[PDB]
């Protein structure tokens with residue numbers, strides 16, 4: 001049971017949702033958010049789906 | 054001036070920081086455990102204040118030094 | 132004592148987002164006597180570019196260095212130089228004068244489409260603006276590309292492939308002011324660090340860790356219209372004036388570089404350990420096109436022995452005031468903070484150049500009872516030639532650092548005592 | 554040497570519980586060991602922002618707080634629209650860790 005729990009924790013449950021794991025990682029989400037932060041007027045309003053709220 | 058000043062080498066060779074961190078912690082932890090065991094087993098009529106003070110002081114000293122060397126080992130360099 | 136400039140060759144280069152002019156002055160003294168030994172040299176600056184100045188250095192024929200101090204006369208912030216050997220009447224001395232002007236190339240269209248090139252304009256002077264009447268002046272202008280559009284003509288300036296020569300002017304007035312303006316193509320990386328904060332924390336236990344926050348903005352030729360990743364990738368022409376990466380040079384003892392942003396780590400960098408330094412190519416999260424103001428954080432820790440000298444009870448450390456960021460940099464605001472340890476009693480700081488300085492304050496990191504002193508120095512308009520070494524001297528009782536372990540101890544002890552009373 | 558039954562029993566219980574707690578804390582941090590430590594799954598970013606507010610503005614300003622940066626056409630009152638226990642716990646741990654100078658950013662406290 002100990003070994004099973006360790007394997008399930010290691011290989012399935014630990015994962016990021018901000019970065020797509022492919023070892024090469026492409027963090028397009030963060031780059032887009034940073035651009036939107038630094039290169040829009042201070043009152044710009046962006047609309048998306050409720051997931052990315 | 055600046056020519057007659059020696060380079061400031063650390064007082065403890067950094068390669069000795071890991072070896073010193075484990076030992077100082079282990080001993081410390083050991084004593085700590087002892088103290089707590091002593092406080093659960095011993096009744097009111099079988100408690101010596103000097104023994105408790107001695108063991109607690111030893112544990113505190115060793116634990117403080119071990120915690121410092123670990124905190125410095127991770128790289129905080131306090 | 133009247134001074135005559137004989138030959139003045141002025142080579143200006145405008146390839147960078149900068150204007151560097153090097154004048155090879157040759158000074159002679161007049162035949163009149165009762166002048167003895169002249170020992171002072173006077174330098175002037177035109178009122179157009181007196182505020183956009185970053186550095187003015189003066190050398191001598193061969194390998195040498197000299198000292199200039201700012202002076203006021205009763206106005207263009209005239210400088211004066213102290214010559215090593217005073218020149219008698221009838222002697223001649225060669226003095227090389229190198230100045231650097233920042234924020235002087237203005238983009239003329241001011242709005243460029245994702246598939247166009249930058250056209251900048253420069254407005255300087257024809258003649259050597261000096262308080263002495265010169266004799267033979269020749270100016271050579273170095274450009275970025277061979278796409279000039281309008282250069283003022285005075286003496287039929289011939290044109291080579293990318294360098295423009297101006298006919299030698301036989302004689303000039305006392306103050307020889309004139310307006311010279313070029314409109315050329317400069318598709319080079321324009322980049323301005325708006326505010327860089329350098330924090331240097333010293334620790335007598337191990338090493339010293341320096342971290343710097345960098346706000347940087349692409350100034351010239353702001354972007355109009357839509358940006359398209361497709362055209363940017365599948366067409367190498369489009370995107371000329373943009374920037375993609377820049378390399379920092381680290382002092383060859385850096386050990387823990389991280390390059391974090393304000394929102395998380397950044398996985399786009401490449402560091403190579405060289406024999407004399409540590410090169411680090413950096414890509415921002417996104418390419419810069421016009422006014423895109425990226426902001427990042429770069430920090431590292433190096434061995435203490437390399438930058439810390441201790442004799443008796445005194446310690447003295449010398450480090451670079453402003454460190455390399457990218458080739459031909461420019462800063463608009465720079466704040467140095469040096470975080471000394473707790474027992475820094477007599478703190479003196481030797482500045483290589485005049486640095487504006489604010490009052491000292493206290494910093495409270497982990498094992499601090501009464502805090503630790505920090506030294507803050509504010510400077511503006513820094514260029515690549517402002518990379519010098521600042522040394523601070525302070526006395527520090529060696530026993531005192533022992534208060535950092537003991538502190539921890541006491542806390543532990545308190546807990547045990549609490550148990551006892553319970 | 555010989556020990557009493559009570560002493561060996563207490564030592565065994567203490568050792569087992571210490572090992573179990575250390576293992577529980579150790580097993581939790583796999584993601585932190587791999588990728589850099591950042592709040593994830595974009596559900597807790599709201600909690601994270603809220604915790605930062607509580608850590609840099611106070612409680613009385615947090616209890617009655619109106620957020621104009623979300624649901625722009627309407628109004629969202631964060632002070633009374635969510636159960637505040639997690640933010641209070643994090644802010645209390647943060648202030649305790651800051652009284653004794655163990656200064657740690659709000660993000661590291663939220664992560665761990």
Ligand SMILES: *[C@@H]1O[C@H](CO)[C@@H](O[C@@H]2O[C@H](CO)[C@@H](O[C@@H]3O[C@H](CO[C@H]4O[C@H](CO[C@H]5O[C@H](CO)[C@@H](O)[C@H](O)[C@@H]5O)[C@@H](O)[C@H](O[C@H]5O[C@H](CO)[C@@H](O)[C@H](O)[C@@H]5O)[C@@H]4O)[C@@H](O)[C@H](O[C@H]4O[C@H](CO)[C@@H](O)[C@H](O)[C@@H]4O[C@H]4O[C@H](CO)[C@@H](O)[C@H](O)[C@@H]4O)[C@@H]3O)[C@H](O)[C@H]2NC(C)=O)[C@H](O)[C@H]1NC(C)=O
Nearest residue numbers: 025388389390396397398399400401402403412587588589
């Ligand atoms: C948190 O953030 C930090 C910081 O951002 C993250 O850290 C970063 O992680 C990346 C990993 O992607 C590290 O990258 C590495 O960079 C080094 C250095 O490479 C530079 O120098 C090379 C030297 O080239 C010499 O030789 C050539 C001729 O061959 C000459 O022409 C040169 O002049 C030099 O003399 C150079 O070749 C590199 O070029 C690359 O970049 C340019 C752009 O400038 C491109 O055009 C090129 O095509 C080329 O891509 C570069 O200039 C590299 O050496 C590392 O490569 C290793 O890993 C590669 C795969 O990732 C692999 O393909 C390489 O072969 C190399 O492999 C090495 O290691 C393997 C095992 O790992 C071995 O199997 C293998 O044999 C070999 O030994 C890598 O690219 C950053 O350095 C690092 N940054 C910092 C500050 O540490 C961190 O990851 C983040 N945390 C996360 C995400 O969790």
Ligand SMILES: CCCCCCCCCCCCCC(=O)O[C@H](COC(=O)CCCCCCCCCC[C@@H](C)CCCCCCCCCCCC(=O)O[C@H](COC(=O)CCCCCCCCCC)COP(=O)(O)OCC[N+](C)(C)C)COP(=O)(O)OCC[N+](C)(C)C
Nearest residue numbers: 075078082086089093126127128387566567570571574575
């Ligand atoms: C297994 C052996 C371990 C040996 C330990 C050695 C220490 C080594 C240190 C770790 C090394 C780390 C290596 C490292 O750092 O690598 C770096 C990378 O850096 C990192 O990122 C890693 C950083 C990780 C650092 C983490 C360090 C944290 C260490 C904490 C330590 C541990 C081990 C133990 C924690 C103890 C937890 C306490 C548990 C509480 C128990 C609850 C008690 C339950 C209870 O109530 O029982 C009752 C009885 O009552 C009691 O009496 C109990 C009171 C106990 C209270 C406390 C006692 C604990 C003592 C334990 C010994 C039972 O109730 P009952 O009696 O039954 O009730 C009945 C009552 N009546 C009704 C009366 C009968 C290397 O990276 P590098 O690359 O080198 O970076 C360096 C680079 N540079 C920066 C240098 C440049």
Ligand SMILES: CCCCCCCCCCCCCC(=O)O[C@H](COC(=O)CCCCCCCCCC)COP(=O)(O)OCC[N+](C)(C)C
Nearest residue numbers: 089090091092093094095096097546549550551553650655
């Ligand atoms: C950044 C780093 C910060 C470091 C934080 C330091 C943490 C300090 C830990 C404090 C330890 C608590 C002390 C404690 O547990 O008290 C125990 C009572 O023991 C119990 O009954 C169970 C309590 C166990 C709780 C331990 C959780 C502590 C976790 C803190 C992080 C005393 O019980 P006793 O008094 O011994 O009961 C025996 C009574 N007889 C009459 C039978 C003798």
Ligand SMILES: CCCCCCCCCCCCCC(=O)O[C@H](COC(=O)CCCCCCCCCC)COP(=O)(O)OCC[N+](C)(C)C
Nearest residue numbers: 387389391430582585586589590646649650657661662665
């Ligand atoms: C009860 C009252 C007291 C409450 C006490 C609360 C205890 C909080 C425990 C969390 C400790 C946080 C440690 C931590 O932040 O480590 C992380 C990531 O770095 C790591 O690798 C750490 C992972 C495992 C370390 C876990 C040690 C925690 C031990 C606590 C007992 C660092 O993240 P970064 O932000 O990346 O730091 C790097 C920045 N530099 C510039 C320095 C490089």
Ligand SMILES: [Mg+2]
Nearest residue numbers: 131335472532
């Ligand atoms: Mg110290």
